[PDB]
A paper describes a structure:
Bacteria respond to transient living environments through transmembrane-integrated sensor histidine kinases (SKs), which act in concert with their intracellular cognate response regulators (RRs) to elicit necessary adaptive responses that are critical for their survival and virulence. The SKs and RRs have evolved into a two-component signal transduction system (TCS), whereby stimulation of the SK autophosphorylates at a conserved histidine residue to initiate a signaling cascade. The VicRK in [name], which is an important pathogen in caries etiology, regulates acid production and tolerance conducive to dental caries, including proton expulsion (F1F0-ATPase). In addition, VicK has one [name] domain and one [name].
In this study, we report the crystal structure of the entire intracellular portion of VicK (aa 31–450), which comprises an SK dimer with one signal transducer, one signal sensor, and one intact kinase domain. VicK crystals diffracted slightly better than 3 Å; however, because of strong anisotropy, the final structure was refined up to only 3.3 Å. The overall structure of VicK comprises a dimer in the shape of a long slim rod. In addition, the [name], PAS, and DHp domains are organized as dimers, which are connected by long, straight coiled-coils of helices α2 and α6. The VicK [name] domain appears to be a stable four-helix coiled-coil with classical knobs-into-holes interactions, wherein three pairs of hydrophobic residues from helix α2 form a central hydrophobic core with knobs-to-knobs packing, and it is unlikely that structural alternations of the [name] domain play a central role in signal transmission. The VicK PAS domains form a unique dimer, which is mediated by a leucine-zipper. The dimeric architecture of these domains looks like a butterfly, wherein the DHp domain (aa 199–269) is a four-helix bundle of helices α6 and α7 with a phosphoryl receptor histidine located in the middle. Interestingly, the two monomers of the DHp domain bear an asymmetric fold. However, the upper parts of helices α6 and α7 are remarkably different, wherein helix α6 bends ∼25° at Pro222 toward the central DHp axis and α7 moves ∼11° away in the opposite direction to avoid a possible clash. Although the overall conformation of each CA domain in VicK is the same, their positions relative to the DHp domain show dramatic differences, which generates an asymmetrical ATPase dimer.
Residue numbers in the entry:
A (entry chain A): 37 to 269, 275 to 304, 309 to 390, 398 to 432
B (entry chain B): 28 to 302, 309 to 390, 397 to 434
């Protein structure tokens, strides 16, 4: 009695410090025994309601945890308040790192919390939040935490990883840029031949070949197409050919092309007869492009010097020009794949370098303003 | 005699206690009690007096968390829904109720397999956890939706498997872009290849043993004109490419559009006539910042369109007026016109009613206009004929 109060007092002090405890036994039908019964029943009742509350809260945070896409939410201000695992991985971040931070702290792309809360925007970030060169492209869409009153609790962003789709896009973008750039010169050749030859179809002293080199060129352009597609969706072939003859074919093409008619001189600096195993087509591609920008960059007429010499390291072919070529800012990048697409406005010749490397060859360049550019190709 | 009093006070304190605690068991909070300072019933009364505040504090905090989470998971942009070992939808948020045109109520009467006879089971959906795609109405008017649903493995606080978690992403616009871009590259291919296989089939006749005897000049004509078509096409394609890579940006300079137009149209009457009716309207200073190069691209292209659309009577009317917020340029021709079904389609790349000859051109025009923050569209009756209208900011 005096004791039962000590005991029950104890039980309740336990319940206070969060420590649950078994029921006390109802001794008599006393009036406080009713109180003992009531405290028992309370400890149990609130126990259930508690385990239940935590059960559902947990179910929620569980869903958010094992969820596939990334989710984060912020106060009206915009400091991160919630950020799930997935979002953490996508953004290269821990909950720790994230909670002292603000959505605007995403690559500092200069948009405002109010722009955000007004427009509930659907936009796309790009970052290397993944250690090495590996990148990730994330599409983040926003929504409001609006309460019934209209009050905005904060922001709710979902981040889908679209880092692949981005790729497939730059691949096809790439294909278009390529096919448009690479068909140019063969197309201009076929033009020049059929064009000059639209007057001079007779002159069988030239016409039989004319038609044939133009035919071979449109056939080259088709095998070109298939290649360029498969590049984002290549293949090599080789035969032994007379290389001086090669350069004379290739160069005679350009020669003809310039004879009509707007507004540069190229001199063969080989000698006569060099035999080497290569792919006619793809080598023609390489030389074609190198000559392309060689002429492109050359001011006032043209100093374009094709000088090729042979040794025991075999073929060493050089193409020299005027104008400028430096700095070492552009120099190293001009051979990298996505250059032509991701640029800021050089030329191309990545595919050139690659057709050279597939020949187990080397291809470098030196160039200085008001001196010109020299490209060099080394074949086995 | 005040011993009786003491008994009274105590028992009444205990009764008061049973009041408070019985009212706790029912989940209702009542005011603190009066301490018998200093009885030992004071200690108990005060203990319950605190216990209440405890239950309440904990419950309010936990509640706040649970509700933060709850709001986040429903007001979030994507469809979310959870299930149990069965697959029966246990959870579904706003966005998902919308994407699926259902209600939490009628939705929870559903199991996850309940879609278009999907042909997948829970027992093989938990293993693969792999995402896939459904196209469904589930939305209002003339429109249909497409959902990318990524499945995920749900679990408890213990290792055990709770059920499934599906996120549904309304990705119809994305899907649309993707599709049309694909068709774009496909087009570039077919479109360049077929002139090639054409010119190749000709030159191949001009060598296989038919070289320059009977139809030669005509084969050189065909082949030449065709390779020039491929030339122009590849030029257009380069331009569009620059536009797609956001490299091709504008260069604007405040110009008198009325004069610009006269220059351009003189230039045009020129470059045209060798082997058509051009009618001018403006006649007054219309100062507007444009990129003369690009804008000339546009106008020249639309004029050429007008031409490719006429028998010989042309009748191209350039008519351009100015409201207080816009310059309205319009190029009208009494030609064939355009099917109302091709009408919303003609500015598409490599889209042609029937060619018959490009073939982008019109696309470039639209894109440049859009670059000026303007608009352009077609109208047609098939008689009289098609007319294109461009809208540009101010003057």
């Amino acid at each position: 009695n005096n004791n039962q109060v000590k005991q029950l007092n104890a039980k309740v002090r336990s319940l206070i410090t969060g420590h649950y405890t078994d029921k006390l036994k109802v001794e008599d039908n006393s009036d406080l025994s009713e109180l003992v019964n009531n405290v028992n029943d309370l400890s149990e009742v609130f126990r259930l309601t508690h385990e239940n509350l935590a059960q559902e809260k947990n179910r929620l945070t569980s869903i958010l945890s094992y969820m596939t896409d990334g989710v984060l939410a912020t106060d009206r201000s915009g400091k991160i308040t919630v950020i799930n695992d997935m979002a953490q991985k996508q953004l290269n971040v821990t909950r720790e790192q994230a909670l002292e931070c603000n959505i605007l702290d995403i690559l500092d792309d200069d948009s405002y919390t109010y722009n955000d809360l007004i427009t509930k925007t659907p936009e796309i970030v790009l970052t290397r939040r993944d250690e090495y060169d590996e990148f990730i492209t994330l599409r983040i869409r926003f929504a409001l935490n609006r309460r019934e009153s209209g009050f905005i609790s904060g922001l709710i962003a979902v981040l889908h990883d679209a880092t692949e789709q981005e790729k497939e896009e730059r691949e096809r973008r790439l294909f278009v840029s390529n096919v448009s750039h690479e068909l140019r010169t063969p197309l201009t050749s076929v033009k020049s031949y059929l064009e000059a030859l639209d007057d001079g179809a007779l002159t069988e002293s030239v016409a039989p070949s004319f038609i044939k080199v133009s035919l071979d060129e449109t056939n080259r352009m088709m095998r070109m197409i298939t290649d360029l597609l498969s590049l984002s969706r290549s293949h090599l072939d080789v035969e032994l050919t007379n290389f001086t003859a090669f350069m004379n074919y290739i160069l005679d093409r350009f020669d003809q092309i310039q004879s009509q008619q707007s507004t540069e001189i190229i001199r063969d600096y080989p000698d006569k007869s060099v035999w080497i195993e290569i792919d006619t087509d793809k080598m023609t591609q390489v030389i074609d492009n190198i000559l392309n920008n060689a002429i492109k960059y050359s001011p006032d007429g043209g100093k374009v010097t094709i000088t090729m010499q042979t040794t025991d390291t075999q073929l060493i072919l050089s193409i020299s020009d005027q104008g400028l070529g430096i700095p070492k800012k552009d120099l190293p990048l001009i051979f990298d794949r996505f250059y032509r697409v991701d640029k800021a406005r050089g030329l191309g010749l990545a595919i050139a370098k690659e057709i050279v490397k597939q020949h187990k060859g080397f291809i470098w360049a030196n160039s200085e303003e008001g001196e010109g550019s020299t490209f060099t190709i080394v074949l086995p």
